[PDB]
Design an enzyme around this catalytic site. Structure first.
Site, PDB file in Angstrom:
ATOM      1  N   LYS A 103      -5.092   5.917  -6.208  1.00 13.70           N
ATOM      2  CA  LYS A 103      -3.695   6.336  -6.255  1.00 13.70           C
ATOM      3  C   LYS A 103      -3.271   6.666  -7.679  1.00 13.70           C
ATOM      4  O   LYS A 103      -2.617   7.686  -7.921  1.00 13.70           O
ATOM      5  CB  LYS A 103      -2.798   5.247  -5.675  1.00 13.70           C
ATOM      6  CG  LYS A 103      -2.785   5.177  -4.173  1.00 13.70           C
ATOM      7  CD  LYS A 103      -1.768   4.165  -3.701  1.00 13.70           C
ATOM      8  CE  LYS A 103      -1.902   2.856  -4.447  1.00 13.70           C
ATOM      9  NZ  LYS A 103      -3.160   2.150  -4.107  1.00 13.70           N
ATOM     10  N   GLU A 150       3.544  -2.117 -11.921  1.00 16.92           N
ATOM     11  CA  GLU A 150       2.145  -1.756 -12.066  1.00 16.92           C
ATOM     12  C   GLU A 150       1.580  -2.327 -13.363  1.00 16.92           C
ATOM     13  O   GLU A 150       2.235  -3.104 -14.063  1.00 16.92           O
ATOM     14  CB  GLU A 150       1.991  -0.241 -11.988  1.00 16.92           C
ATOM     15  CG  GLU A 150       1.661   0.228 -10.598  1.00 16.92           C
ATOM     16  CD  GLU A 150       0.435  -0.461 -10.053  1.00 16.92           C
ATOM     17  OE1 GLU A 150      -0.594  -0.480 -10.759  1.00 16.92           O
ATOM     18  OE2 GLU A 150       0.498  -0.996  -8.928  1.00 16.92           O
ATOM     19  N   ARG A 151       0.342  -1.954 -13.676  1.00 16.27           N
ATOM     20  CA  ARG A 151      -0.337  -2.504 -14.838  1.00 16.27           C
ATOM     21  C   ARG A 151       0.339  -2.058 -16.128  1.00 16.27           C
ATOM     22  O   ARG A 151       0.793  -0.919 -16.249  1.00 16.27           O
ATOM     23  CB  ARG A 151      -1.801  -2.075 -14.851  1.00 16.27           C
ATOM     24  CG  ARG A 151      -2.651  -2.689 -13.762  1.00 16.27           C
ATOM     25  CD  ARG A 151      -4.071  -2.179 -13.849  1.00 16.27           C
ATOM     26  NE  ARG A 151      -4.851  -2.486 -12.658  1.00 16.27           N
ATOM     27  CZ  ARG A 151      -4.937  -1.693 -11.598  1.00 16.27           C
ATOM     28  NH1 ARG A 151      -4.289  -0.541 -11.575  1.00 16.27           N
ATOM     29  NH2 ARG A 151      -5.673  -2.051 -10.559  1.00 16.27           N
TER      30      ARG A 151
HETATM   31  N1  LIG Z   1     -11.841  11.142  -8.487  1.00 12.07           N
HETATM   32  C1  LIG Z   1     -12.568  10.069  -8.874  1.00 12.07           C
HETATM   33  N2  LIG Z   1     -13.816  10.209  -9.365  1.00 12.07           N
HETATM   34  C2  LIG Z   1     -14.547   9.150  -9.748  1.00 12.07           C
HETATM   35  N3  LIG Z   1     -14.112   7.883  -9.681  1.00 12.07           N
HETATM   36  C3  LIG Z   1     -12.879   7.599  -9.207  1.00 12.07           C
HETATM   37  C4  LIG Z   1     -12.021   8.702  -8.768  1.00 12.07           C
HETATM   38  N4  LIG Z   1     -10.870   8.155  -8.350  1.00 12.07           N
HETATM   39  C5  LIG Z   1     -10.980   6.816  -8.507  1.00 12.07           C
HETATM   40  N5  LIG Z   1     -12.176   6.483  -9.015  1.00 12.07           N
HETATM   41  C6  LIG Z   1     -12.618   5.104  -9.316  1.00 12.07           C
HETATM   42  O1  LIG Z   1     -11.941   4.217  -8.434  1.00 12.07           O
HETATM   43  C7  LIG Z   1     -11.007   3.395  -9.125  1.00 12.07           C
HETATM   44  C8  LIG Z   1      -9.652   3.627  -8.487  1.00 12.07           C
HETATM   45  O2  LIG Z   1      -8.620   3.029  -9.252  1.00 12.07           O
HETATM   46  P1  LIG Z   1      -7.113   3.485  -8.970  1.00 12.07           P
HETATM   47  O3  LIG Z   1      -7.162   4.540  -7.901  1.00 12.07           O
HETATM   48  O4  LIG Z   1      -6.468   3.802 -10.289  1.00 12.07           O
HETATM   49  O5  LIG Z   1      -6.489   2.145  -8.346  1.00 12.07           O
HETATM   50  P2  LIG Z   1      -5.113   2.115  -7.525  1.00 12.07           P
HETATM   51  O6  LIG Z   1      -5.350   3.071  -6.390  1.00 12.07           O
HETATM   52  O7  LIG Z   1      -5.002   0.677  -7.095  1.00 12.07           O
HETATM   53  O8  LIG Z   1      -4.066   2.546  -8.521  1.00 12.07           O
HETATM   54  C9  LIG Z   1     -11.007   3.822 -10.576  1.00 12.07           C
HETATM   55  O9  LIG Z   1     -11.203   2.694 -11.424  1.00 12.07           O
HETATM   56  C10 LIG Z   1     -12.170   4.769 -10.722  1.00 12.07           C
HETATM   57  O10 LIG Z   1     -13.226   4.099 -11.408  1.00 12.07           O
HETATM   58 MG   LIG Z   2      -2.485   1.970  -9.175  1.00 14.65          MG
END
Ligand SMILES: Nc1ncnc2c1ncn2[C@@H]1O[C@H](COP(=O)(O)OP(=O)(O)O)[C@@H](O)[C@H]1O
Ligand SMILES: [Mg+2]
Ligand SMILES: Nc1ncnc2c1ncn2[C@@H]1O[C@H](COP(=O)(O)OP(=O)(O)OP(=O)(O)O)[C@@H](O)[C@H]1O
Ligand SMILES: Nc1ncnc2c1ncn2[C@@H]1O[C@H](COP(=O)(O)OP(=O)(O)O)[C@@H](O)[C@H]1O
Ligand SMILES: [Mg+2]
Ligand SMILES: [Mg+2]
Lengths: 50, 469, 469
Positions: B160, B186-187
């Site tokens: 997300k 959030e963080r």
């Molecule tokens: N498009 C992408 N390509 C490669 N790795 C991804 C991608 N999207 C997310 N990730 C991996 O999955 C994790 C998703 O974290 P994130 O989506 O920021 O958490 P949240 O959804 O809880 O905010 C990331 O740390 C990243 O390493």
């Molecule tokens: Mg997030």
């Protein structure tokens, strides 16, 4: 209602209460707005019985 | 005189007694004092309820650790206000309106109350203009709207925030208007990361950042979204220039409302959420809107608790959106990025009278193929593909290639893998997926459809894998 | 004087205060007045609890909109009474005992209290006489008891109302006694339908209808069954001749008792039902019975909430019945009507000593075949029918023909299929299903068994599809 499925299989009469139940983004509001829009010819007729 | 007096302190909720005839109105801002020399501060309380007997229940916006019963409470007379104007562009702010990078900045600006009313009904117009991003799945199956509301639903760690950053890279850089970013619950590390990356991408001078993060009492996490929305409403009404509004985890606003409601002594509703869940969600989300002639393109990330899409919070959020991109953990585990569930995601402008006949037809064909694949998934899980009909085998091959070609290497994913991003025009996307759903690529392996751009990237990867188009 | 005073009004529950010594007994009927000219009426209140300190908690039978605190409440000194006698036949009545089509009719009749004790145990006698209806599935697998307790279970909108109309057509049209129909918390369109259709069949002159429908407050839906049951008890005990008692969705009694259990101050039970669920259901259901020499053939429809037959209301109703016809939505979805589940339905006179050896043998064989088919269905759905044995494929063909031959074109469903109804004697049913289980029609297609009557209809429809038998 102007819809083949509804008018053929689950017909609606005047005085009836038909439930449009379903998930989100399946066409409930579409069905109801089309039911409303299909009464344009009935309105343009003029007699209060149609 | 007329000053109040703290009576009860139940967490970050404070009950205050005022002399009769001097009861503060709802949403008013009161000031109390904590004198413990290590926790010395001035609490900003917000009147929430009138309890009777001249009592008033308020939500504290700072932690009440060290607050004593009987201390003096000063009614400011007005609700919490935030600075508004051009000056807020390029700075980081609190929920209370305090500049973080440059303290004391903005205290001479115009100050607007964070509690506004939504625009009148006669001011509203539906927005049906497509916003082209460059992502294949978003542009094909859930086209975004100019001046409409967009959300990214998803469980924990499905992408997300990375998708929020991707859309910041795509939409906010080539933008002409002004941008507001609220980080709700959030963080803090992510807030600093975004601050730095917007400073270096030369986008900060157009962006105003408001942060109420995970280490804040529920009142701050409930009101920071209203503060950022107030700045966006100023940019839309008084200046009228194409606002963008990114909100990171509006669900944290919902959750802070839940906690505050539990502390206020309300009866818990279903699951445990507050009884006023939909009312608070509507009061907030109905101000995030474009009026006739004045635009706010909104994009919010919505957390899905325990990967439960039937949870009351996202299920209530769903009704306020024009385009919902839903990220699945099933898709995330297959390595497909963005992990967009194509069958659950939707958009209100995927309509032949908006996007065109070929766009809509190709999208419906892709969705039909993927739905048939999902229907067969059970048999395929037990017996494999070898037992299906020949038609079903062909369709499952096409569906595997399609569900892999909806993946893409995003601009924000270069920090995780090292491979740069890719932009695909919408006409090229429609043509490519038309060729896929027609069977023009059924000979290329399942890989080489993985994390690429348009048809030239597909050709390069297939020729590196010994295939051709 | 010795009147009451309204103290509290929380929805349908009203608190009243009386002077010491003039407290009305439990279940008394009190009268209050609503003087607002658009809603002016006389509220009937049934004393439910003695709250202490001369307070009394009552349930209102009419909507309390317009009721003021402190108005006068007159204690009638008796419970709710309904008119009884051979003069209630041919008229539609109220839960209060008021004639609907001809107001004022019956105010000079004998009036009986709607609260009775069930007959003494020494007067009870088991009933083991078969009531031949004319439906194949009912006559075969769920033989109804003459003078016994019959029920139709099923979810929302499967077959219950159509089946009760069918049984009014079959059993009540050529009856030598009286019929009483209680519409307990059902639709009003269906009530008018039944009124008109009984006037058409000249059956109304023998039937007494008592209606309290879904739009009524929970007091009416809680007491209408007792009113109609008091009319039936008069016809059984005083006149003493062969009463028929039909009740539509009696469950609504339980549900209305559940709607006010928290307002009466009772802690909720497992699934949100009242703690006194089984006790009230037993107090009501034990009056619906045939004493020695005095017959009441009862037939109730029982709504099963959310198709869950483990819900406490149907699970508690199950213990009061001699025959149960349990309708499924899985059989409704297949087009089979009536949608009787042959594996769940049961009867106590399905005994070789009651229905004979051949009836019982054929019924047990049909049940065994259908159970084996239900056990094979998953294998057939995943691995295909060609994976089974030859014995199992034979049995599957037989079971599909059998489950289609249990369906029938009922007389009351001509409005839904345009097709006239059929009637099949019990001996023809026995011999037909004997031939099916033996395999005499394994060459006739699966259709030509679907919505037909006896073996002549089977021959007609088989030859209509190019086959013989
Ligand atoms: N498009 C992408 N390509 C490669 N790795 C991804 C991608 N999207 C997310 N990730 C991996 O999955 C994790 C998703 O974290 P994130 O989506 O920021 O958490 P949240 O959804 O809880 O905010 C990331 O740390 C990243 O390493
Ligand atoms: Mg997030
Ligand atoms: N009969 C139809 N044929 C093709 N498309 C349809 C049909 N009915 C609805 N749709 C499409 O479905 C989309 C959403 O449907 P609709 O909004 O009516 O569902 P809904 O039940 O209102 O869901 P929600 O209330 O959650 O928005 C619309 O964009 C519309 O184009
Ligand atoms: N024997 C039948 N033939 C055809 N349709 C039927 C039959 N029985 C029930 N139905 C269908 O089921 C619908 C509702 O059934 P009904 O018994 O009224 O529901 P409920 O059991 O909830 O009262 C009817 O509108 C009718 O179309
Ligand atoms: Mg809708
Ligand atoms: Mg019914």
């Amino acid at each position: 209602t102007g819809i083949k499925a509804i008018d053929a299989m689950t017909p609606i009469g005047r005085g009836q209460r038909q439930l449009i139940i379903g998930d989100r983004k399946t066409g409930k509001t579409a069905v109801c707005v089309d039911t409303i829009l299909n009464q344009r010819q009935n309105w343009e007729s003029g007699d209060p019985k149609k | 005189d007329t000053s109040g007096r703290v009576v009860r302190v139940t967490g970050p909720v404070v009950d205050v007694e005022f002399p009769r005839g001097s009861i503060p109105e709802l949403f008013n801002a009161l000031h109390a004092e904590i004198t413990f020399e290590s926790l010395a501060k001035t609490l900003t309380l917000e009147v929430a309820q009138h309890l009777g007997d001249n009592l008033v229940r308020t939500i504290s916006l700072q932690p009440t650790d060290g607050l004593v019963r009987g201390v003096e409470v000063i009614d400011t007379g007005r609700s919490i206000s935030v600075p508004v104007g051009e000056g807020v562009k390029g700075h980081v702010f609190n929920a209370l309106g305090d500049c973080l990078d440059e303290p004391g900045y903005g205290e001479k600006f115009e100050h607007w109350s964070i509690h506004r009313k939504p625009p009148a009904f006669e001011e509203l117009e539906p927005r049906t203009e497509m916003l082209e991003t460059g992502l294949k799945v978003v542009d094909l199956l859930t086209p975004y709207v100019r001046g409409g509301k967009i959300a990214l639903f998803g469980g924990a760690g499905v992408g997300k925030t990375v998708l929020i950053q991707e859309m910041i890279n795509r939409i906010a850089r080539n933008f002409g208007g002004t941008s507001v970013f609220a980080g709700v619950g959030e963080r803090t590390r992510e807030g600093n990361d975004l601050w730095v990356e917007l400073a270096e991408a030369n986008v900060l001078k157009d962006t105003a950042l408001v942060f109420g993060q995970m280490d804040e009492p529920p009142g701050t996490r409930m009101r920071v979204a209203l503060s950022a929305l107030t700045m966006a409403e100023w940019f839309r009404d008084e200046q009228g220039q194409d606002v963008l509004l990114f909100i990171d985890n509006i669900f944290r606003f919902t959750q802070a409302g839940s906690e505050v409601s539990t502390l206020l002594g309300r009866m818990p509703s279903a699951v445990g959420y507050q009884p006023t869940l939909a009312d608070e969600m509507g009061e907030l989300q109905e101000r995030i809107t474009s009026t006739r002639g004045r635009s706010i393109t909104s994009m919010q990330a919505v957390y899905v608790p325990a990967d439960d899409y039937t949870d009351p919070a996202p299920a209530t959020t769903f009704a306020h959106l024009d385009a919902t991109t839903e990220l699945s953990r099933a898709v995330f585990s297959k390595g497909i990025f963005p992990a967009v569930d194509p069958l659950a995601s939707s958009s209100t402008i995927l309509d032949p009278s908006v996007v065109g006949d070929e766009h809509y037809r190709v999208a419906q064909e892709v969705i039909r193929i993927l739905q048939r694949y999902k229907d067969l998934q059970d048999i395929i899980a037990i017996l494999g593909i070898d037992e299906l009909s020949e038609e079903d085998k062909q369709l499952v091959n096409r569906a595997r290639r399609i569900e892999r070609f909806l993946s893409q290497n995003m601009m924000a994913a270069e920090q995780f893998t090292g491979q740069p991003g890719s932009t695909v025009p919408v006409k090229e996307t429609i043509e490519a997926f038309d060729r896929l759903c027609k069977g023009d690529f059924d000979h290329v392996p399942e890989q080489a459809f993985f994390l690429i751009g348009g048809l030239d990237d597909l050709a390069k990867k297939a020729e590196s894998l010994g295939a051709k188009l």
